[PDB]
Amino acid sequence: LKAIIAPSVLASNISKLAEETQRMESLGAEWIHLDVMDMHFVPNLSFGPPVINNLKKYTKSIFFDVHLMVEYPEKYVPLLKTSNQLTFHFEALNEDTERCIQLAKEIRDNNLWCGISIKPKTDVQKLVPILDTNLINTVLVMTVEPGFGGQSFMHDMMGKVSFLRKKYKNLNIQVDGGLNIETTEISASHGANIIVAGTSIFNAEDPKYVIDTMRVSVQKY
Numbered sequence: 001l002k003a004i005i006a007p008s009v010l011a012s013n014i015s016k017l018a019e020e021t022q023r024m025e026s027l028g029a030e031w032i033h034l035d036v037m038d039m040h041f042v043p044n045l046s047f048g049p050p051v052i053n054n055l056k057k058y059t060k061s062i063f064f065d066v067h068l069m070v071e072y073p074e075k076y077v078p079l080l081k082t083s084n085q086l087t088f089h090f091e092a093l094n095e096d097t098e099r100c101i102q103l104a105k106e107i108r109d110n111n112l113w114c115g116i117s118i119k120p121k122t123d124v125q126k127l128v129p130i131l132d133t134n135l136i137n138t139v140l141v142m143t144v145e146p147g148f149g150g151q152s153f154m155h156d157m158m159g160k161v162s163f164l165r166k167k168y169k170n171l172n173i174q175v176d177g178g179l180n181i182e183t184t185e186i187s188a189s190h191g192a193n194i195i196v197a198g199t200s201i202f203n204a205e206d207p208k209y210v211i212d213t214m215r216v217s218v219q220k221y
């Protein structure tokens with residue numbers, strides 16, 4: 001397990017996506033978190049494969065972490081072959097294990113990391129059957145109602161994080177929604193090792209300071 005900081009571009013000046021990502025890259029961010037929303041799974045439309053595929057032309061080593069907050073996530077796999085991890089929602093596939101296992105198999109067969117996400121009201125234990133197959137590289141625990149940035153961190157989601165870390169020691173646990181210096185420390189104390197932060201990084205007075213502070217706090221655990 002590694003301490004990973006993944007700035008969420010949704011909170012940046014997206015009309016300058018390439019510039020913002022290169023900046024995060026120059027500051028040492030290991031991953032770049034790309035939120036794809038289709039105005040159906042969530043009430044917001046962000047950007048899709050055409051934008052992400054073009055961005056890849058201007059980046060270097062930064063890992064492409066795509067969070068698919070969309071219906072029919074299976075349709076996006078062939079459109080994002082140059083990315084690094086594709087994370088789909090357990091809820092997008094009607095919470096049925098077999099369908100999730102099949103999509104995960106396909107994503108892994110495209111030589112991509114596979115992530116699965118659950119919203120605040122979804123019970124973490126429902127993921128066990130899928131997680132036991134070892135096909136999932138990352139579980140993205142939403143710490144806020146997905147769709148928009150700027151919302152407040154839900155401390156009551158930490159139980160999900162502890163459950164996962166205790167049961168799966170090598171599983172990457174990602175938190176997303178309201179992460180800042182203080183809530184990153186809280187998340188890491190429960191087992192999170194990948195931190196998605198939007199507002200706290202892109203609106204920071206000293207971006208690198210925030211990123212480094214966050215990483216060290218995760219590494220401590």
Ligand SMILES: [Zn+2]
Nearest residue numbers: 035067176196
């Ligand atoms: Zn996300």
